[PDB]
Amino acid sequence: GGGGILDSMVEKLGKLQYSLDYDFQNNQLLVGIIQAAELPALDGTSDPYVKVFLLPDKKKKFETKVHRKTLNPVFNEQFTFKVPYSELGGKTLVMAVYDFDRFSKHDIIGEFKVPMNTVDFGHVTEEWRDLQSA
Ligand SMILES: [Mn+2]
Secondary structure, three states, X not given: OOHHHHHHOOOXXXXXXXXXXXXXXXXXXXXXXXXXXXXXXXXXXXXXXEEEEEEOOOOOOEEOOOOOOOXXXXXXXXXEEOOOXXXXXXXXXXXXXXXXXXOOOOEEEEEEEEEHHHOOOOOOEEXXXXXXXX
């Protein structure tokens, strides 16, 4: 009654652990794409990879390596965004997990966003985030 409330709940599409730190010495944002867990199987298991990028920036998106046939990949990758601190406040970091497929569109598994204006810089941020439907 009931069903409508269940439909509003966050779907079980897995989670991604990432870390974030602004390097004030070099003036760049550092992002760690650590691992994902409990991904749904779209293939069976999926072939997950993560796209990492800033909005509204129109720059080419960074991507992790593809991890074949796993619902619990460990990426252990780091990415760097050369952006002065004063300009970072208006941007939003996006992390999106996709299922690599060689013969068809890569299905999105889920994504989430981290507005830079609500992040506590000066201390390394690390958290698990539930992937949201795209
Ligand atoms: Mn696949």
